[PDB]
Amino acid sequence: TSQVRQNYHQDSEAAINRQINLELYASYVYLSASYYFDRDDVALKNFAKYFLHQSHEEREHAEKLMKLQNQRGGRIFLQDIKKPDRDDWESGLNAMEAALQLEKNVNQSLLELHALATDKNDPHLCDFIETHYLNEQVKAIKELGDHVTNLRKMGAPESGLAEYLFDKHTLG
Amino acid sequence: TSQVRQNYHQDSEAAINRQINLELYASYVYLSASYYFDRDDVALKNFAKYFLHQSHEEREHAEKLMKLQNQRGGRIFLQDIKKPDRDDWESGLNAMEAALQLEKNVNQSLLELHALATDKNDPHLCDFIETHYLNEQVKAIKELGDHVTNLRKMGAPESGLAEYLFDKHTLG
Amino acid sequence: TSQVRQNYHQDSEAAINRQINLELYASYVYLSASYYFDRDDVALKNFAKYFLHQSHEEREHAEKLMKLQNQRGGRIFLQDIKKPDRDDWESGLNAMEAALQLEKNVNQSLLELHALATDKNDPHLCDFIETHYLNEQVKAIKELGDHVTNLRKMGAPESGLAEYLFDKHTLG
Amino acid sequence: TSQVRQNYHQDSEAAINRQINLELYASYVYLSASYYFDRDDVALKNFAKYFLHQSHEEREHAEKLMKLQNQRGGRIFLQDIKKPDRDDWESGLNAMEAALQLEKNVNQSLLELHALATDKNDPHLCDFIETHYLNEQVKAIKELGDHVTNLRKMGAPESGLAEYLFDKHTLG
Ligand SMILES: [Mg+2]
Ligand SMILES: [Mg+2]
Ligand SMILES: [Mg+2]
Ligand SMILES: [Mg+2]
Ligand SMILES: [Mg+2]
Ligand SMILES: [Mg+2]
Ligand SMILES: [Mg+2]
Ligand SMILES: [Mg+2]
Ligand SMILES: [Mg+2]
Ligand SMILES: [Mg+2]
Ligand SMILES: [Mg+2]
Ligand SMILES: [Mg+2]
Ligand SMILES: [Mg+2]
Ligand code: NA
Ligand code: NA
Ligand code: NA
Ligand code: NA
Ligand code: NA
Ligand code: NA
Ligand code: NA
Ligand code: NA
Ligand code: NA
Ligand code: NA
Ligand code: NA
Ligand code: NA
Ligand code: NA
Ligand code: NA
Ligand code: NA
Ligand code: NA
Ligand SMILES: [Pd+2]
Ligand SMILES: [Pd+2]
Ligand SMILES: [Pd+2]
Ligand SMILES: [Pd+2]
Ligand SMILES: [Pd+2]
Structure with a gap:
């Protein structure tokens, strides 16, 4: 047993390792989406910048969970980072909709965590999740919902003008 | 009944007074350890500085609980501050190991609090403990575990050179 | 065919996608090594910082190859990022030796690229590899060789004092 | 024989003179396109500014090749700069498509150079082309491809609103 370990259930330790993998997976999804918009036949540079920033934020989320695992005396066990479900993200609207679903899936995992x-009476871990993750997810989901709404109302994806102007005025 | 008191159980009030005493006791333990390293036959000035800083932090912990007691309309009842369990702390490694055990004991008291x-449905008190105490304890326990590990790997306590160099490079 | 594509062989496009995966894999290896040294029973903070910096550099290497793929009109195809070969990296010396082998493996892949x-008469891709990757690898391999040599001469891994002092004086 | 000449083939000397003419021709094409957008019945000032900047860059490309010719001991022989293939460039999209084709033609000439x-074992000339010309062409072709894509998706050339807004938001 680690000399620092106290009130840290083996199920919590395992769930934190699963969350580390999910944060790394989300970083990878956003990296894929970013460079789709860097293609010469897509060419929306602020969509690319937005998703790259999101990718780097998810890596920070994963590193903070790795720090937590060691703080509590658990042991990090890494797994393969699965490739994203799409190679081609279709449009700015479709990528925003995919990001919305991704952030809701990550949120559901954090709520289960x-x-x-709570069931294992670990108030430090509860506070860690609330302080560093739960409102971050609520803000991300709200922002992506806002983006999806605007793109739909502007006429995307059929209007390439809509995605161009959204790229300039909202993401620029 | 205090005019400010609301949703503050008499058991919680009593538990806060017990925690005040424990924080003051921890301040006293660290004060004792500090001046052990100021002895001419021990003479590790950065061990002394480190434990003195920890002593002053524990006094701040106690004062914040005294403030909380009054904020919620409870009444402070002080008890004797017991002297530490050792007069002679033996070595830098032994003192770090004692501090690790002390911080884990304080953490267990905070978890019981x-x-x-939680049982008395006092979310303000839960948030107070989480925000100001629980992660502070996790960080302190992790730091002390790190220190103990390094001292052991360097060859302490048998190597006086190990404790000298740790004093200079980690605590300096 | 992409409107920008010129003198860019399909074999080169495929080899760049394989190199993207290898750079991401190297980032993951270094991330694993970093948090091993953050464990409370290892506790070498500058080893942890050094490998985390290396991890972030490899992610930058991967992103630059993704940019190149799009610049030349190829199409990015991502694959799973495999987990590192170790969960426990044993010692500072063993991790440095693993990093040395990793950087030599990445170098061999770049030389094959x-x-x-060269065989496909792509001087732009040759210059890209030479300018941004080949000397970076030579410098990384030389630095890691230097680190391995010093740790061995100091008495690592059996001397925990050696790894402690190397952490302070070379990586600090 | 020039006193500075060393490892500089007469075929390379001739090819450099041909490249000088092609760079000057590209400068002239871009100058023509620039002032088309300055016409009162076209009136897209940022298209005009963009192509004028490209024109001045091509003149710099030509001057650097003239410097190289003298550095290596070859002798500059100039030829007529042919007028561009169009007097009327039709639209912002059509001019961007013409510029894309021009930059790909210049790139093909540089690859043949x-x-x-390489065939004459002139590594200094190879490095000169790689360092100062080949990535410049890859970046120019990618940028023009991006511009063409956006204009098409926005509805150009039939939408005068598309070219107006692209002029303001991408070229401004
Ligand atoms: Mg996240
Ligand atoms: Mg699969
Ligand atoms: Mg908050
Ligand atoms: Mg305390
Ligand atoms: Mg007594
Ligand atoms: Mg907090
Ligand atoms: Mg690399
Ligand atoms: Mg496997
Ligand atoms: Mg070469
Ligand atoms: Mg170089
Ligand atoms: Mg040119
Ligand atoms: Mg003519
Ligand atoms: Mg270059
Ligand atoms: Na435990
Ligand atoms: Na357990
Ligand atoms: Na927040
Ligand atoms: Na908020
Ligand atoms: Na009450
Ligand atoms: Na009561
Ligand atoms: Na804290
Ligand atoms: Na923390
Ligand atoms: Na090609
Ligand atoms: Na091919
Ligand atoms: Na370099
Ligand atoms: Na060098
Ligand atoms: Na010659
Ligand atoms: Na010759
Ligand atoms: Na360049
Ligand atoms: Na570039
Ligand atoms: Pd259980
Ligand atoms: Pd009660
Ligand atoms: Pd030293
Ligand atoms: Pd081939
Ligand atoms: Pd010849």
Whole structure:
């Protein structure tokens, strides 16, 4: 047993390793989406910048969970980072819709993690999830919902003018 | 009844007074350890500085609980601050190991306090403990574990050179 | 065919996608090594910082290859990022030796990539590899060789004092 | 024989004179396109500014090749600069498509020049072409491809609103 370990359930330790993988997976999805918009036949540079920034944020999310695992005396076990579900993201609207679904899936995993921490009476882990993850997810989901709404109302994806102007005025 | 008191159980009030005493006791333990390293036959000035800083932090922890007691309309009842369990702390490694055990004991008391606040449906007290105490304890326990590990790997306590160099490079 | 594509062989396009995966894999290896040294029973913070910096550099290497793929009109195809070969990296010396082998493996892949670009008469791709990758690898391999040599001469891994002092004086 | 000449084939000397003419021709094409957009019945000032900047860059490309010819001991022989193939460039999209084709034609000439320098074992000339010309062409072709894509997706050339807004938001 680690000399620092206290009130840290083996199920919580395992769930944190699963969350680390999911954050790394989300980083990879956003990296894929970013360079789709860097293609010469897509060419929306602020969509590319937006998703690249999101990718780097997810890597930070993963590193903070790795730090937490060691802080509590658990042991990090890494797994393969699966490739994203699409190679071609179709349009600015479709990528925003995919990102919305991704962030809701990550949120559901964090809510299940919080339920486990609550069931195992781990208030430090509960506070960690609430402080660093839950409102971040609520803000991300709201922002992506806003983006999807605007793109739809502007006429995307059929209007290439809509995605061009959204790229300039909202993401620029 | 205090005019400010609301949703503050008498058991919580009593548990806060017990925690105040424990924080003051921890301040006293660290004060004792600090001046052990100021002895002419020990003479590790950065161990002394490190433990003195920890002593002053524990006094701040106690004062914040005294403030909380009054904020919620409870009444502070102080008890004797017991002297530390050792007069002679033996070595830098032994003192670090004692500090690790002390911080884990304080953490266990805070976890029992949080369980009580949860059982009495006191979300303000739960948040107070989480925000100001629980991660502070996790960070302190991790730091002390790190220190113990390094001292052991360097050859302490048998190597006086190890404790000298740790004093200079980690605590300096 | 992409409207920008010129003198860019399909074999080169495929080899660039394989190199993207290898750079991402190297980023993951270094991330794993970094947080091993953040464990409370290892506790070498400058080893952790050094490998984390290397991890972020490899992600930059991968992103630059993704940019190149799009610049030349190829299409990015991502694959799973395999988990590193170790969960436990044993010691500072063993991790440095693993990093040395990793960087030599990445270098060999880049040399095979340059041979392909030479065979397909792609001077832009040759120059890209030479300018941004080949000397970076030579410098990384030399630095890691230097680190391995010093750790061995100091008495690592058996001397925990050696790894402690190397952490402070070379990586700090 | 020039006192500075060393490892500089007469075929390379001739090919450099041909490249000088092609760079000057490209400068002239871009100058023509620039002032088309300055016409009162076209009136897209940022298209005009963009192509004028490209024109001045091509003149710099030509001057650097003239410097190289003298550095290596070859002798500059100038030829007529042919007028561009169009007087009327039709639209912003059509001019961008013409510029894309021009830059790909210049790139093909540079690749043939590099093949000659490789065949004559002239590594200084190879490095000169790679360092100062080949990535410049790849970046120019990618940028023009991006511009063509955006104009097409926005509805150009039939939408005068598309070219107006592209002039303001991408070229402004
Ligand atoms: Mg995340
Ligand atoms: Mg698969
Ligand atoms: Mg918050
Ligand atoms: Mg305290
Ligand atoms: Mg007594
Ligand atoms: Mg907090
Ligand atoms: Mg690399
Ligand atoms: Mg496997
Ligand atoms: Mg070469
Ligand atoms: Mg170089
Ligand atoms: Mg040119
Ligand atoms: Mg004529
Ligand atoms: Mg260059
Ligand atoms: Na435990
Ligand atoms: Na357990
Ligand atoms: Na937040
Ligand atoms: Na908020
Ligand atoms: Na009450
Ligand atoms: Na009560
Ligand atoms: Na804290
Ligand atoms: Na923390
Ligand atoms: Na090609
Ligand atoms: Na091909
Ligand atoms: Na370099
Ligand atoms: Na060098
Ligand atoms: Na010669
Ligand atoms: Na000759
Ligand atoms: Na360049
Ligand atoms: Na570039
Ligand atoms: Pd359980
Ligand atoms: Pd009660
Ligand atoms: Pd030293
Ligand atoms: Pd071939
Ligand atoms: Pd010849």
